[PDB]
Amino acid sequence: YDPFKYVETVFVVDKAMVTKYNGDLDKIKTKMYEAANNMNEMYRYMFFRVVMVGLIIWTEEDKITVKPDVDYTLNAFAEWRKTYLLAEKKHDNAQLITGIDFRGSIIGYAYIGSMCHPKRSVGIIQDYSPINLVLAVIMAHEMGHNLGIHHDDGYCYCGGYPCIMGPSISPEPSKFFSNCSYIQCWDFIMNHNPECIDNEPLGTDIISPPLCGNELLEVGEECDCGTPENCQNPCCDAATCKLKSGSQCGHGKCCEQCKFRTSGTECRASMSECDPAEHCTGQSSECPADVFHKNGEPCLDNYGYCYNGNCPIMYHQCYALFGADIYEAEDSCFESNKKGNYYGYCRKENGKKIPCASEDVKCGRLYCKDDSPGQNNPCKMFYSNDDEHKGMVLPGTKCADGKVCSNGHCVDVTTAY
């Protein structure tokens, strides 16, 4: 079990910023590298890493309309990030850093509980102070909200210091999250499972200048276990980020007791028959990159087709939602998906619930035959306005012979992928 999470962050600097600093892009980049490193230190206490995988500076033009209206600007940045940035760069989170003055007293604005969401995993931050720590606190705070953390109240504690998630910025702010923030962060991890922050980024993914002792393995380093004081890695000389004599390795899934694990030691368990396991090579400290079998390949005694390492099937989705003895419902149940009502639809289009056509009914809301003693329901579904997508048939689910669900359509498996 890897205890740490990793937020792969792209930072976007607007034209107003460029202007504010008189076109001095080196000064801007350095401020951003420092800010990201301060964030990293803040988040460490919560078993989190903040990692700069991108730095975009809008010197020619802004790619959105940056407005004092934080709602317009948060949303405009969120849209661009989803449809343009996510297509050019693999990352978990994006922050906009602006030289403009937001309307009112606001210096930071971010969606709550959004980490990993294609659109909503973004924050916007006004460059409010030349003190790098102050700016880093605002950036940490807004990413806090992405992490389903709300503002500190009551007895939330982080030493004597002012905590990062206090609703107002402190004159002399600290690097410390509160106990409430830690709890809410990991409760959000538990509850909503943001899977994009699980992976440890490659050194070649990190675009900030390598720094020995930030606990991030970067280009030019053999190991990194943090500061000499915090280092609990016997393979690693903390000060120099060099392997100690005798050490073959000091990092990775295929490193044990400073030695390469032997050939064929499992380093990534197979999550299904569509996901081949990966094993240590013997000649490297790193588990090979994750391989899946081809999407659309028949699986689970011809009950499914492969979709990204899994075999999504109706019975298992009923099982996950409702428990051991719940089976696939009869075809008739799925006719409720023609309703276009609160639960009965195939997909959404700008928030509007689109009813299923006859050929697509099995790709909307899932229905299950529930024979629970005294609470029988032949067409049991799950609906909660907390997450309207929970209980919807999963992408890649077999909906007929030779057909899978794709965007709430039952489509030919051959041309689906």
Ligand SMILES: *[C@@H]1O[C@H](CO)[C@@H](O[C@@H]2O[C@H](CO)[C@@H](O)[C@H](O)[C@H]2NC(C)=O)[C@H](O)[C@H]1NC(C)=O
């Ligand atoms: C985080 O820690 C602080 C201090 O450890 C907790 O506050 C204490 O608990 C009660 C409330 O249940 C206060 O009235 C006590 O006086 C506090 N003790 C102190 C200040 O020493 C706080 O409960 C914890 N917060 C959460 C949400 O877990």
Ligand SMILES: [Ca+2]
């Ligand atoms: Ca890409």
Ligand SMILES: [Ca+2]
């Ligand atoms: Ca203002």
Ligand SMILES: [Ca+2]
């Ligand atoms: Ca990631």
Ligand SMILES: [Ca+2]
């Ligand atoms: Ca490092």
Ligand SMILES: [Ca+2]
């Ligand atoms: Ca695999």
Ligand SMILES: [Ca+2]
């Ligand atoms: Ca039937």
Ligand SMILES: [Ca+2]
């Ligand atoms: Ca359902």
Ligand SMILES: [Cl-]
């Ligand atoms: Cl109804």
Ligand SMILES: [Zn+2]
């Ligand atoms: Zn806030």
